[PDB]
């Protein structure tokens, strides 16, 4: 996953 919310 890529981007600010990748962890979610």
């Amino acid at each position, epitope marked *: *996953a*890529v*981007g*600010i*919310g*990748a*962890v*979610f």
Partner: antibody
Amino acid sequence: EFQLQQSGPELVKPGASVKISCKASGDSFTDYNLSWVKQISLEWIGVINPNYGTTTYNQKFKAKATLTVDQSSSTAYMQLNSLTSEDSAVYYCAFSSRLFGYWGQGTTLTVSS
Amino acid sequence: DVLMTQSPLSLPVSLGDQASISCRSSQSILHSNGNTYLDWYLQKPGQSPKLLIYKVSNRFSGVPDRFSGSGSGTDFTLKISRVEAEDLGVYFCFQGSHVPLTFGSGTKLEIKR
């Protein structure tokens, strides 16, 4: 194709509230989420997954911000409540997906009586 | 919260110089799932931040190879092998491992004269 669209500039009186929007569209992604970031210096407000309505907040913004989704239109909203001059800023929507992220153009909010 | 600091805050360079920007976190950015969600962004004036490097050292597609990232745990470094004019702007590191997600204060890459 891919597009990330944010609503336009807002002028709000102190103590009032405002609701701004962000929408991701295109055939280039499946699952995704949308994060809100404040710039006066970047600060993360929270994240919403529009397809599940799940949210995670920065506790700092738990009262100040409410994140919602209109699943009919796939449009995410952030409501900012009880505005002070601390809240005048640019608010970015940041899209995250399996293969790419992307930041919107930003929504400027100006608080003034 | 995980606090992110960058050094230096201002980095004057001549075109063609090597540039190094460091980022330190107050706790480790390694997530229990094994990933380290440390990203590097560039923001040009009047524009939205743009992703350069994700998860410490992965160049996003389209980012030139003069940009590279390294580090682990609490210490990270962005390097530009040879600065070009399009590189000037403010660089932010970002940790996306631990809520609230947080940004460094930013490093202004500017022209030396």
